[model samples]
Target: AQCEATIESNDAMQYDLKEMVVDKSCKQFTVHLKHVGKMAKSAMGHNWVLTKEADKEGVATDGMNAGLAQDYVKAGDTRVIAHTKVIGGGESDSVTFDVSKLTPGEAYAYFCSFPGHWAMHKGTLKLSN
Candidate 1:
């Protein structure tokens, strides 16, 4: 998965993976998100959003204000490193970020910004071998 990686989300408000490794060889990376649950978009919508570890709370907070029209991510928020569109059961979205945006030793966090989904549906990413 040079330029892409796949992740799955389900109805339990959980993402299958809690952590991911990003290899340095990738000039860029894409997160392919899948919502395999049977819920509707509004009741259990989900999306992938990325940001620095320290920015998680900040981004998630601002994203709530950004609303669904902005994909639950703040419009033009510099703290947002990357994101995908809201998706429901059987639906999907993807987010690609320049590998250069990732720091080798720093923690990068990714989560679904659908209202309260971020708390339970999230994962950590880090540059790795």
Candidate 2:
């Protein structure tokens, strides 16, 4: 879809999508995250977090401190543009944000903040012409 994307995550701490592009015409953008593996949240939880490429590590780190109850994302973290709640096997979550929040040609980073998963379960997002 031009304004939305569906990404898949599994127990292996992997996200199927390595990159995504949001059309410039879109006023709002949505991201849907699906957990395809059969694992419990405590053992294998995944969530979609979005931020600037440079802020990825910082957000991920603070999100970890925020803990699972906060969906692995820090509350009131302005660095985050949009994010989906953490989900386990067979579960899914979605988040939508105004497209204007993104700057065209700038680098946006997306990843799962499940402890050590950020490094492996990550992707890039861009605004398309």
Candidate 3:
């Protein structure tokens, strides 16, 4: 369905897709994030965090300070639209956000906030009518 999508991450710090699209007909969007590798969360954790392209670096930096207990996401970060908890290999997490949060032409970003992972594991998201 256009309302839902599944994204995958691996121990090599990669996402299965480089970009995602949110259909305009959707009032809500769901992202199911899966860690498709075999590794401990402490060694290779992953999560899905959504933000604006402009806020990506800031969010990732603060999120790193937030620690793993917080799913590597800043506490009450207004810039974050949605996020999934940290997961290890064979684990999965899902997050849903309001479609209205997306601006037609704005570039939305999603990435794994595990310490140094954001720099290598990130993708763009956009709305499509």
What TM-score goes with each of the models?
A: 0.94, 0.96, 0.96
lDDT of 2 at 4: 90
How far out, in Å, is residue 82 in model 1?
A: 0.6
Ten contiguous residues minimizing lDDT sum, candidate 2 = 120-129
Q: Which segments of model 3 are wrong by more than 4 Å?
A: none
Model 3's alpha-carbon lDDT is 0.91
Against the reference, the lDDT scores of all candidates come to 0.86, 0.91, 0.91
Find the 10 residues in a row with the least total lDDT in model 3: 120-129
lDDT of 1 by residue, 1-129 (tens): 777888888887788888888888889899999999999887788888888888898899899998887889988899888899888899988888899988886788989888888876558998883
On residues 27-103, what C-alpha lDDT tens digit does candidate 2 reach at each position?
A: 99989999999999999999999999999999999999999999999998999999988998999999999998999
Write down the RMSD of all candidates, one decimal each.
1.2, 1.0, 1.0
For candidate 1, what is the TM-score? 0.94
- Model 2 compared with the native: what TM-score? 0.96
Question: What is the model-wide C-alpha lDDT for candidate 1?
Answer: 0.86
lDDT at 101, model 3? 86
